Amino acid sequence: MINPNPKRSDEPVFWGLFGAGGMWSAIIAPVMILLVGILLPLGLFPGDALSYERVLAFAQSFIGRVFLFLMIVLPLWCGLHRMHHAMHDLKIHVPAGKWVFYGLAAILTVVTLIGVVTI
Amino acid sequence: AEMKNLKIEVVRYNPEVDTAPHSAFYEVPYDATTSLLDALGYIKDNLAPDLSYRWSCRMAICGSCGMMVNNVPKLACKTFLRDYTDGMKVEALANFPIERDLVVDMTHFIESLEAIKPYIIGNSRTADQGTNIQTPAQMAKYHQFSGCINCGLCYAACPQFGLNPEFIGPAAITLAHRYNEDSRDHGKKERMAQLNSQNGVWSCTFVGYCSEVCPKHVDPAAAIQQGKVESSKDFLIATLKPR
Amino acid sequence: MQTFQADLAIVGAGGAGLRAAIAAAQANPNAKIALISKVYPMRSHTVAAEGGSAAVAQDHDSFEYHFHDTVAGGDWLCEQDVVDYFVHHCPTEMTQLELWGCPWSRRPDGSVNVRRFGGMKIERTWFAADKTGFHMLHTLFQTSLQFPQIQRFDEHFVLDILVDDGHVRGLVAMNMMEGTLVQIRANAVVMATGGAGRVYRYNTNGGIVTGDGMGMALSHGVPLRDMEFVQYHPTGLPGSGILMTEGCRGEGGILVNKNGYRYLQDYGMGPETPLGEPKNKYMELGPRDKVSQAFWHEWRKGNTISTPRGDVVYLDLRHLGEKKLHERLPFICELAKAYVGVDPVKEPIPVRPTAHYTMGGIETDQNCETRIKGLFAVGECSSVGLHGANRLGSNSLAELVVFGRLAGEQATERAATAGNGNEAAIEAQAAGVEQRLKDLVNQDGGENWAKIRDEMGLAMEEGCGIYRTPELMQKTIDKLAELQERFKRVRITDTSSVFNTDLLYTIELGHGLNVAECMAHSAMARKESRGAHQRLDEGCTERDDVNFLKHTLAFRDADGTTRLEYSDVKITTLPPA
């Protein structure tokens, strides 16, 4: 009735990134959504602080190169891992769901790595 | 002398007669101290001798008392009619097959509990050498998880086990974690295989409602998380394992 | 009937039963062992014990001290050679339990801590916090899983045992879920069915504790020994009877009347001790019997508080404080809040004397063997001769693991040298069990079992309290006999096969009625006061070592009558005084 020899789950890997993706997002995401989502387009910032010129200067620099990558990549892995389980939680049947969601993740991860090395 | 009355809804099922469970209503006298278990007894003696249920201790220590009360997992043993003044509906324990009335098939539980090998492994000490040495500190490592009474309440509460019957379950993982973390136990590798399985710890999505319904405050959800961290550690070591 | 083969069969999944299974599986690795129980093993009543298990551990302690404590406490109705064996095997057994993973409480240095219970001078009781019974059973149960020798019949009700030519050859049992009957054939059987507390109206016992095991022994001409000795626990909740541990008193809790006057100083348990400093054998740590009696004395005076659930005394603990409660008494707090609506921080808890433990039980020799060859009794259902006229607190758990081991080992010896019985006769014996079942089902006459249950309990409550009179003992004897005849006019209206508890409870009430009659006749026949059994009539106020220093043996004949015989008491090293 219960299998004596079960297959080791591959889950720890996806869960591993999920943990870091969840932590980064809990710590840094609020302030980021504030800047990019609200402050920038409403123009509520002192002088030339979030002008094309200044944002690029940070973007091109090595610190901001690493930062932008992590701020994008990590939260995706968290978010997508969750949606994969929401499907199963809603009794919705998605074929190759595993590969579909993490497939998406890997694609964008590559797109971003490509982006942060400049095009 | 006059005692106040209450109309209780009980969901009845007879394999001999009934196709599906159907409801039956009973007028039962109550006071400030009347437990659901008391009320069930009253019905059996007077209103219906054909009612069946499980119970023994009368004091929330045995655990055979599990059932649903207005869609909530509770022990009849410790449920009080004073609280459900507006109305009360009693179903058999959820996520489990109904054998009869309020009596359920709890094979999977026992079997899951069996699978994890919940006993001391590979400690060669013998009686005539005195006890092991274990510090109050070393004990506080596993103590809380050792207090589980196999009520089943957490399995009824867990949505994941509802969706998947094969999943070994909270109570079972908790007990496995109990021995894993015991300073006297050298059988950590023996029960990891089960925990590492998809039906192991990796079916919990940390809903946490099992910890919410535990009458004995085990907090099994924490045992699972620690179990996931331990499983991850094992997975890592096992990746570098080609020796 | 489906038949089964097994080397030995153990009836009862309690602490003693489990210990016996484990012992037998180790004594013989190749054995096939049937472990039968009407509930899942972890639901056995042993799960409810809170105090601890008595075993000698301290440097300044001695086996003689524990021996003397028990014999004196049993008021010299102890088989002294049995008590001797008992004391010497406690350390070994408790340690073994630790080895299997029992979470005994510890000293800062990592060694095993002991606390005081049951009036002993030197505190030798090992304790798994407040969950000692829960821990011992779950430790024993989880350990038993590693042994493939043990085959378990979960939720299986045993109707009768199979005897021929003075030897046991098996048993008959019913699969509870299926409602089907099965034979199990074994050349040795161990009885571990617990006590008979549920025969009283107000008790500390779990529903399952109905006196079955004894009830079967009786019907086969085995005597029940010392059945008149019934132990009341001084502090149980009113109505429900739920146990309040002696640990509460052990931490310095108080018992008071409606006037809040500590009443225990009145009965020679003075002088009154300071709140923070509670002394053994004084006031609230006074003897089981004395404290119980004292309530009854205060009841007579109109000093007891009257509740809709009965007359009560108050155990005040609110003068203790939060931090003290939580380390050793947290369970008690949660009980109080739920069952009586009382916070042991804010308000006083209603409590009273309540029927607790069965000192009597199936007669056994030093080996736990009955008069019937190959039949064993162990645990509360038995009478090995350990407890005598009164049981020392925390010795019951100790007995389970000590005598469980011995029972298990001896039955394995007896099974191997048994030889073969008469096949045709045994089968016919089992046929007659089934016929007797059909007979009960066909029975008609519109008697509600429940009303007969309620009345027996009331009779035992009023007939066999702490204090006993010939007028009231006879009234009960008379009542029970009337009920006996009434039991024959009951109709089980539920005819369903699947988990039919209507049928079960009615059968359980059978064994109850039988056993109560053994208690009642024995109590009446003993014209003295000794330990738990106390009489008020003239010449019975004091213990009589001249005429009553003997065990009571109760036999039920084929005609339904309770006969009595008396066996002598073994005294090895300590004369009576």
Next chain:
Amino acid sequence: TTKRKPYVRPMTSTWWKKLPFYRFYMLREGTAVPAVWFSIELIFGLFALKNGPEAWAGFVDFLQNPVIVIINLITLAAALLHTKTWFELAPKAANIIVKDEKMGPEPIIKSLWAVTVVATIVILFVALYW
């Protein structure tokens, strides 16, 4: 033949609507949607800022749209819920004893909020002041 016929109750897709506890859990997992959405928007920005000043100007005009402001407002509310819940659960992962008692998760929840509080200002300072 056996006389028992075990009855299994089904489990609907709408199992989570029945109990308030489940509903909250659903919602907590529901934060993953906006979490992805924002991470998407940043890709747009990274590429639009790369294509030159003209493209970035149009990326800002996209954010100027009321819907985007509203949808981003919800996104921040979502991020904030994630934070509150994540901080509540993570502490249940480590099992640490201080002296002879298993330590509470309360001190850990504090530590995390502090780190967020300092991180937020430190970031807001660099971002806006210079």
